């Protein structure tokens, strides 16, 4: 089949977990963006 996920994901996992430990989420909507 081959995966839809790839070697890009290998980088995205380190970025997400990095910020995840202390990102500070701000509650918004798309209309206000």
């Amino acid at each position: 089949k081959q995966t839809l996920l790839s070697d890009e994901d290998a980088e995205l996992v380190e970025i997400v977990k990095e910020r995840l430990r202390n990102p500070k989420p701000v509650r918004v909507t798309l209309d206000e963006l």
């Binding site: 994901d9 290998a10 980088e11 995205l12 996992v13 970025i15 990102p23 500070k24 798309l30 963006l33």
Partner: protein, 95 residues
Amino acid sequence: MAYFLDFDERALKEWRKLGSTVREQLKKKLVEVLESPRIEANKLRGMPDCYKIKLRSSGYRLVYQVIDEKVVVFVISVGKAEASEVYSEAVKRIL
């Protein structure tokens, strides 16, 4: 919106540093996930709670996490990250 929208503080600044039309594309890809965010096709490799959306032509991407407890799409990363030049440039410290 079924799911609410949340953004990482760094990610707020991330959309500001990229093209205006680029962020709007991401926003529309967000309105659809805010209805149904579990797009298993776009799942990340390692984090089952996270998915990646990407812009076919623009080359930018967005990574979000689906928080069911708080019912919110929490975008963690916005901008360009990739596979290609990650290998090409690789490092800048220890060769």
